[PDB]
Amino acid sequence: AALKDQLIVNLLKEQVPQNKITVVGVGAVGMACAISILMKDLADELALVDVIEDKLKGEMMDLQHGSLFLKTPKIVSSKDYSVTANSKLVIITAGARQQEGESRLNLVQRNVNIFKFIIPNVVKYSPQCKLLIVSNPVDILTYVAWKISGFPKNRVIGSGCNLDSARFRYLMGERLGVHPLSCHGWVLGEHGDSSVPVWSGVNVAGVSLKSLNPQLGTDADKEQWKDVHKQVVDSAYEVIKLKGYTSWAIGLSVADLAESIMKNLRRVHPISTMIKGLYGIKEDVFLSVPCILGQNGISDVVKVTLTPDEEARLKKSADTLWGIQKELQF
Amino acid sequence: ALKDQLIVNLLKEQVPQNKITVVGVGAVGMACAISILMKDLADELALVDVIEDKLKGEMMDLQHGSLFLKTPKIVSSKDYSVTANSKLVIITAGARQQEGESRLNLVQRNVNIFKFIIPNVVKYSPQCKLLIVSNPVDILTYVAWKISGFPKNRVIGSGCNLDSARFRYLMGERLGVHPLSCHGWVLGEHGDSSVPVWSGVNVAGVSLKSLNPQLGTDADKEQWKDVHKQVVDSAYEVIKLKGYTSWAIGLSVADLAESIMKNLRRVHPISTMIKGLYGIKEDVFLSVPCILGQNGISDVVKVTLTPDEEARLKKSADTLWGIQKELQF
Amino acid sequence: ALKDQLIVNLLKEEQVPQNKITVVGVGAVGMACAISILMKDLADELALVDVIEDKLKGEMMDLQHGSLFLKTPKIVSSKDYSVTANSKLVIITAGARQQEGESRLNLVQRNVNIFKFIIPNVVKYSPQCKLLIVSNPVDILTYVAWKISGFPKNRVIGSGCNLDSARFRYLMGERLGVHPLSCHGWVLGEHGDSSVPVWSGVNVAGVSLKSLNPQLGTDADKEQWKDVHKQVVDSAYEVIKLKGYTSWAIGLSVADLAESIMKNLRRVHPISTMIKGLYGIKEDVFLSVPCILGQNGISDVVKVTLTPDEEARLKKSADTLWGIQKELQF
Amino acid sequence: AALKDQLIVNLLKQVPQNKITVVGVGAVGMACAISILMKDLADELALVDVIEDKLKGEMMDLQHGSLFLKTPKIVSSKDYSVTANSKLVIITAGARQQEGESRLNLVQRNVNIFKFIIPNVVKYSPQCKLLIVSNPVDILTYVAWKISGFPKNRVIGSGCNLDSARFRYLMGERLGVHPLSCHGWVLGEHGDSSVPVWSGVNVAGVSLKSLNPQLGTDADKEQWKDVHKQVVDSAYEVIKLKGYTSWAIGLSVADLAESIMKNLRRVHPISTMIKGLYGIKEDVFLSVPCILGQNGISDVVKVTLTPDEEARLKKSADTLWGIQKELQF
Numbered sequence A: 001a002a003l004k005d006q007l008i009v010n011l012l013k014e015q016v017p018q019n020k021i022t023v024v025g026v027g028a029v030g031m032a033c034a035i036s037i038l039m040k041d042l043a044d045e046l047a048l049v050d051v052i053e054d055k056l057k058g059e060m061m062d063l064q065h066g067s068l069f070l071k072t073p074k075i076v077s078s079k080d081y082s083v084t085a086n087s088k089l090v091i092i093t094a095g096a097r098q099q100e101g102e103s104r105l106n107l108v109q110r111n112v113n114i115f116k117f118i119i120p121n122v123v124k125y126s127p128q129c130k131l132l133i134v135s136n137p138v139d140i141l142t143y144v145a146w147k148i149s150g151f152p153k154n155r156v157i158g159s160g161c162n163l164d165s166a167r168f169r170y171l172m173g174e175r176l177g178v179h180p181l182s183c184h185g186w187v188l189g190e191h192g193d194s195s196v197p198v199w200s201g202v203n204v205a206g207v208s209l210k211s212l213n214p215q216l217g218t219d220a221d222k223e224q225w226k227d228v229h230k231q232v233v234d235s236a237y238e239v240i241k242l243k244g245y246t247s248w249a250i251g252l253s254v255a256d257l258a259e260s261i262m263k264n265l266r267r268v269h270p271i272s273t274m275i276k277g278l279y280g281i282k283e284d285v286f287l288s289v290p291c292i293l294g295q296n297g298i299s300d301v302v303k304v305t306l307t308p309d310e311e312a313r314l315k316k317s318a319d320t321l322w323g324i325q326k327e328l329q330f
Numbered sequence B: 001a002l003k004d005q006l007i008v009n010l011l012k013e014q015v016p017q018n019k020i021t022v023v024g025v026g027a028v029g030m031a032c033a034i035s036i037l038m039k040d041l042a043d044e045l046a047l048v049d050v051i052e053d054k055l056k057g058e059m060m061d062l063q064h065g066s067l068f069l070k071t072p073k074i075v076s077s078k079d080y081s082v083t084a085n086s087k088l089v090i091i092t093a094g095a096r097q098q099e100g101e102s103r104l105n106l107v108q109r110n111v112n113i114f115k116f117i118i119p120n121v122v123k124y125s126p127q128c129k130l131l132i133v134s135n136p137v138d139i140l141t142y143v144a145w146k147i148s149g150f151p152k153n154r155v156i157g158s159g160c161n162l163d164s165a166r167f168r169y170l171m172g173e174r175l176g177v178h179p180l181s182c183h184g185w186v187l188g189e190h191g192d193s194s195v196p197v198w199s200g201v202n203v204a205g206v207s208l209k210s211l212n213p214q215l216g217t218d219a220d221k222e223q224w225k226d227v228h229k230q231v232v233d234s235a236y237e238v239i240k241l242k243g244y245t246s247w248a249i250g251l252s253v254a255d256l257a258e259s260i261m262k263n264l265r266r267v268h269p270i271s272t273m274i275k276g277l278y279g280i281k282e283d284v285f286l287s288v289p290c291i292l293g294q295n296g297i298s299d300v301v302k303v304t305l306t307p308d309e310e311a312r313l314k315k316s317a318d319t320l321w322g323i324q325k326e327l328q329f
Numbered sequence C: 001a002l003k004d005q006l007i008v009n010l011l012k013e014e015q016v017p018q019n020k021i022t023v024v025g026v027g028a029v030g031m032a033c034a035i036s037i038l039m040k041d042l043a044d045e046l047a048l049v050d051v052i053e054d055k056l057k058g059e060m061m062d063l064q065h066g067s068l069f070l071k072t073p074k075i076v077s078s079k080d081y082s083v084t085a086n087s088k089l090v091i092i093t094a095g096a097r098q099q100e101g102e103s104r105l106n107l108v109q110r111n112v113n114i115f116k117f118i119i120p121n122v123v124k125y126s127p128q129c130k131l132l133i134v135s136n137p138v139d140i141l142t143y144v145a146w147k148i149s150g151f152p153k154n155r156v157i158g159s160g161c162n163l164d165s166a167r168f169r170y171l172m173g174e175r176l177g178v179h180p181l182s183c184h185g186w187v188l189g190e191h192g193d194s195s196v197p198v199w200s201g202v203n204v205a206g207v208s209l210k211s212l213n214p215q216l217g218t219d220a221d222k223e224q225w226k227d228v229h230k231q232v233v234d235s236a237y238e239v240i241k242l243k244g245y246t247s248w249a250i251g252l253s254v255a256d257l258a259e260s261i262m263k264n265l266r267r268v269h270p271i272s273t274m275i276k277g278l279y280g281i282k283e284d285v286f287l288s289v290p291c292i293l294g295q296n297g298i299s300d301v302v303k304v305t306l307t308p309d310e311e312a313r314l315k316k317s318a319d320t321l322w323g324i325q326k327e328l329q330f
Numbered sequence D: 001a002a003l004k005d006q007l008i009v010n011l012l013k014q015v016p017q018n019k020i021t022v023v024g025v026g027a028v029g030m031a032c033a034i035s036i037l038m039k040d041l042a043d044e045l046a047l048v049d050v051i052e053d054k055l056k057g058e059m060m061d062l063q064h065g066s067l068f069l070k071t072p073k074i075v076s077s078k079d080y081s082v083t084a085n086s087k088l089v090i091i092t093a094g095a096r097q098q099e100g101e102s103r104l105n106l107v108q109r110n111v112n113i114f115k116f117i118i119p120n121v122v123k124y125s126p127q128c129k130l131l132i133v134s135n136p137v138d139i140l141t142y143v144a145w146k147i148s149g150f151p152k153n154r155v156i157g158s159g160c161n162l163d164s165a166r167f168r169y170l171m172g173e174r175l176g177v178h179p180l181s182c183h184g185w186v187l188g189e190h191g192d193s194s195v196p197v198w199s200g201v202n203v204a205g206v207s208l209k210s211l212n213p214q215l216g217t218d219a220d221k222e223q224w225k226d227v228h229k230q231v232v233d234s235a236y237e238v239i240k241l242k243g244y245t246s247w248a249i250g251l252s253v254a255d256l257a258e259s260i261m262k263n264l265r266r267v268h269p270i271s272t273m274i275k276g277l278y279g280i281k282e283d284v285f286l287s288v289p290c291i292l293g294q295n296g297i298s299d300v301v302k303v304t305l306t307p308d309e310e311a312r313l314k315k316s317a318d319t320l321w322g323i324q325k326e327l328q329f
């Protein structure tokens, strides 16, 4: 004799990947997570899983053809979860996706049923992975993945408000003429309509915007900054109306989370976690609070000093999620 | 105002220094955009299309990921004034080939689209290089060249950069070597008449043809010609499976944009005018290894081809020249 | 010729680089700036300038030998400033450096004299460049470069407290078990002993560390956070005692500033600029305040809300610097 | 309570996954450290040396740069317990060549130092690959392999990775092509007896020797042998000018660290056992093109050398064995 044997002397046979990531779901969200992770050099092996065989194969092939331009030496796919074995991180993006003029909460029951199949299969092949839930409604689906998986809470992470906070910092950046990296502010709670802008922590160079505008984010705000949060809430609905779905910003947000996990950064992110007994909540609700994310998932939660209104809004967000959650079948 | 209480303006201002425009927000256009953004090649990105909603939606979706990027300005419009001061304009607009349809069948539809696009792009960007991605790429690079009236160094077709990348990936798979360490060139038409240059196929300077002179021929026990057949069929296989191709071409285009933006002077198999080489006496555009930098193609590598490889290259040139003779400007 | 047998030339190009960076001084600081800039792909051309011919050629050849692993296609050097022609950014690291125990202010006259030769030469070949001053005392030498160059203030930037602040965030990160990227705090004023930690702006996820500890950074602080600022001030002296100089952290700090300029990022950095008009400063004092940094240099200044003690400390830093800069011989 | 506990609720009661250790904090060691840090290859970086102050100072200077990096833990100690669980251990410690001194002259000093270093590395990092940088690299890779008890694939010498990068840079400068697009292999000893493989020197698959048969001989009108002479002389000239070399070796080591950490299976000219190849009968380690990945060197490419190139390679092996056979450890 063979040309390979005439060219190369083999001295060694077949080891497990060391930094493998799996993306479940090859829809627009899943492929944007896949491309973003590949372009960030986070994995030595990427595995893709879906139920639509041709689509899955074509997407994997399209990725593989770009191998020369990447540093991920193994791109694999299958409808069979055996392909996901030895993953450090498993990203779930599968299910019904948010529709034009409809809440993400409208996808709940269908995605719970789909997770009843996915989660045990993922768990069977990578019992020590970190689960990263992207599918909507993300906060409810994270709690669901947590209950089905049997994993300790640190290993079940929801993409949550990482994107809402990025959109908020972009918008704040545009108003101020400052790069989003230099605009600080957190959007917590539900990754959806009941999200909470923490105006009290919004700052540039440590300068509290609330200190220069006491009314910041209220109805009395002469600059109507609440409209920036309105823009955050509405963003997915506007993007879906224009292009039919959202993909790029979420793919970049998920890769940002994957980077913190894969490289054990211990950076703080506003991501879905169990808040039972934290803030003002007594229900087994998952929602975004600032978390320290690293190699073991969520190891710590930052306790944000919320104003009485911010606390009320966060309790309201938890209630809206518990309200939907309590009535589900699983 | 809150901005004035927080920030003192000290300076009243300037032209983008490393601007890139992507024409077409279809799957190819959007994969080029995400790839370019994730490689930090531009200080400004402009998007152009004819479908207003889709264009705004794509622009907004990219803008929302700005925190995770290093491209501080992302803009879009149907109006080409948005593309002003681009150093590189990437054209991905036009009809795409169906299963069983040759890229050469897209000619009349895409030339008519280029008749509008090309004069509008060149208008606002004196310093731009035109990078053609739309198909048939070789023919459309000649069309972009004729319409723009640009010098040949400035008009580039993505050509066989992806064909050679695919060939390199497939060779790597057979050998258990990364594509980076698998060398091989696929030249000519980015289509059915492409030419695998078996004479230059190597690992660590070792010629695979020197080890097997039957390499790439029907006599080949390992049927290495099937690797070139797979390169030829690749777009069609992917189209049949997922409906279109996007990721690999996006990465191939960002690779070329990187060499241009960073004046790397790397060698790529890309569409250029070959009048004067291999006995070609006409204004044919096709892929040959080109040195690519800040002024586009400044130099062309003269690949030494065996008589059969040269014959296959002239056959690809005749095929492309025949289609050029059908062009109605 | 072999080159011509292998290659057909199409045109004689205008070889003028688009993103050229010059590093003046090939000492330990200059070379650390050089390697960090090459490893960040910020430049299409890197030029080195020094007065020691052998060391200059040696440093240039060594960086050139690594070209295969880089994306900076031209690395050049000369004692002649003609080699610096058409630079977008010129980083000055040349001059005397602190000996063990030596104040950065002690380098003032020697460095002002060196700058009298350097600055006109830089200006001669790159009249549109942004000047980035790293040589010490940085604040005073930024004033010197400004006066000599005749450039508008936006294009004359001092590395200032970019590193002091990075050290502060690192130390804060170590105390809290959080990545420095998620620890926020600003060290302002002189890049030296009179620097000011802004305790009011020190936070993790927008939670003011002082709101949890009212006595944060004071003598009454049970946890003695003031020692974090003392460690910041002492850092270079401690590193100098141990390794004889500092290099890596300043190199990374300078490339961070180079990145904001070259890529027009408009990020906020605590760097040396004229503060005439802020905190009751009526003179041409250059010192670190948070600045928006982009392609045109310092376009804007963030007005930080200082406590009366913080403002008094900043005005003391301002007076220490003005005492020296007002009497300079040039 | 404490401020930390007022700010943070701990919910989880710490072993690195991609740790790298650099042994020796001289100019080579620190160039390796910064290059690795800037390539984001490790989640933990450990430094080891015998000079306490110097080690502490270097560690501290790296830590102070943590904000600009993605390596969340930088540690150091004289004690090898600090290197626990490394996936890669880079050895740069030992005597370095003076002006006018061969790397081969450092052998006794460096073999004696390796007797202490190698068993302490292996004791705390049983899963690691050993990357030898200290000189003479080829002999020290053999020595580290023998001492360690590690299989030969896990004991790699930086070898000719830098010699080949130097050759590719010089070739690029002569041709006006980026080194990435200039292919050429310098094999054998990382020293005076290195072998430029002229037969494999090519641009885009075009052999330079096919265009110029005299390539690399004294008859060559363009004197391309001066390129290999500059490669051989490079460390001596740089040492004569600046007192040592650091930047190019640092980047060459980070290149090898990348292929290892990311299991790339790229081809590099690095130190491995050549017994059984080109009729070499002894346990000589020298550079040949190797496939490098997560398990180190898994495969060796068999370069087809001309009679003179093969004679030069066997002469390099003979030189190395001349020094190696007289070693006591």
Ligand SMILES: Cc1nc2ccc(NC(=O)CCNC(N)=O)cc2s1
Residues within 6 Å of the ligand: A024, A025, A026, A027, A028, A029, A030, A049, A050, A051, A093, A094, A095, A096, A097, A114, A117, A118
């Ligand atoms: C039992 C099941 N397992 C899977 C696995 C993947 C997918 N794939 C998608 O749903 C992709 C499209 N969806 C979005 N939102 O992008 C569906 C199912 S159903």
Ligand SMILES: Cc1nc2ccc(NC(=O)CCNC(N)=O)cc2s1
Residues within 6 Å of the ligand: B023, B024, B025, B026, B027, B028, B029, B048, B049, B050, B092, B093, B094, B095, B096, B113, B116, B117
């Ligand atoms: C006169 C015209 N100007 C344009 C500009 C953009 C587009 N856009 C596309 O064709 C995108 C979809 N096509 C592919 N190949 O992705 C069409 C036209 S028609």
Ligand SMILES: Cc1nc2ccc(NC(=O)CCNC(N)=O)cc2s1
Residues within 6 Å of the ligand: C024, C025, C026, C027, C028, C029, C030, C049, C050, C051, C093, C094, C095, C096, C097, C114, C117, C118
């Ligand atoms: C008139 C003069 N022009 C120059 C230019 C460069 C240098 N080079 C250094 O000072 C390097 C060493 N110094 C530090 N601080 O690294 C000195 C002079 S004197």
Ligand SMILES: Cc1nc2ccc(NC(=O)CCNC(N)=O)cc2s1
Residues within 6 Å of the ligand: D023, D024, D025, D026, D027, D028, D029, D048, D049, D050, D092, D093, D094, D095, D096, D113, D116, D117
């Ligand atoms: C028993 C011993 N263990 C060590 C460990 C480190 C070092 N450090 C250096 O040798 C660094 C300087 N040398 C070069 N070549 O850079 C020496 C020794 S001696």
